[PDB]
Structure formats: C-alpha cells, structure tokens
Design a binder for this molecule. Structure first.
Ligand SMILES: CN(C)Cc1ccc(Nc2cnn(C)c(=O)c2Cl)cc1
Length: 119
C-alpha cells in the first residue's frame, strides 16, 4: 500500500468516504452473504475454522464508532470478509463467487476513495 494509506490518520472527512464505500458494498446484489455474521447453524465448523470472522454489519458498527485509525485497518477488515469466505468454501460455491465479484467492486471503490483523499 502507498504511504498515505498506511500512515495518514483518518479524519472525519475520510469517514464520510468510508461510509459511502461501505454503503455501496451493502447495496450490491452480490453482497447478500456478507451483510451479517455467518450463522453457525448454517456452517457447523465455521467458527472453529475461521479465527477472525468479519461481516459488513460489524464494519458498519466500527465505522460509526470511529474504530479505524488508518485506511490500512479498514481495508484489512474488508479483506477478511473475502479471505475467510474463500478459505472456508470451495471455488464453485455461490459464496466464493460472491467474494470474487464483491472484492473486485470493493477494489474499484477503494481506488476511487484513495484518489479523492487529496481533494
Ligand atoms: C440467516 N442467514 C441465512 C443469512 C446469511 C448470512 C450469511 C451468509 N453467508 C455465509 C454462509 N455460510 N458460509 C459458509 C459462508 O461463507 C457465508 Cl459468507 C448466508 C446467509
């Protein structure tokens, strides 16, 4: 990551952009598996295997509470959603395919956020 992503403290202005990115993911048709935590009853060994679960509702709470100090930390939580999904599910699973498309969408939006940070 570039040095601004790693080092520049997030401001309130930055948080308006992070909220916009999060809302765009939550509205995407293929974000349906990631809106809320994985239900253990739908995946019985999931919480024994996935040591750091993440989901978009948890990220929404963290954004509201100003949990993130650096953009890197916000990107790391987002990336957990996708990496956990691809770690647990086979490549032909609908969940895995959602992670592939939604991560590409996140990267597009993230690049937009980084470009606008200076202006
Ligand atoms: C209440 N429920 C049915 C909604 C729901 C919430 C999350 C998900 N997402 C899941 C599920 N299982 N697994 C192995 C995953 O990796 C992912 Cl992302 C699906 C439905």
């Amino acid at each position: 990551e570039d040095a601004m992503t790693v080092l520049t403290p997030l401001t309130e202005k930055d948080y308006e952009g992070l909220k916009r990115v999060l809302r765009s993911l939550q509205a995407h048709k293929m974000a349906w598996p990631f809106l809320e935590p994985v239900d253990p009853n739908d995946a019985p060994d999931y919480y024994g295997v996935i040591k750091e679960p993440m989901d978009l509702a948890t990220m929404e709470e963290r954004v509201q509470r100003r949990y993130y100090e650096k953009l890197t930390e916000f990107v790391a939580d987002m990336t957990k959603i996708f990496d956990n999904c691809r770690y647990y599910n086979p490549s032909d699973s609908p969940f895995y395919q959602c992670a592939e498309v939604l991560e590409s969408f996140f990267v597009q939006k993230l690049k937009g956020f980084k470009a606008s940070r200076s202006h």
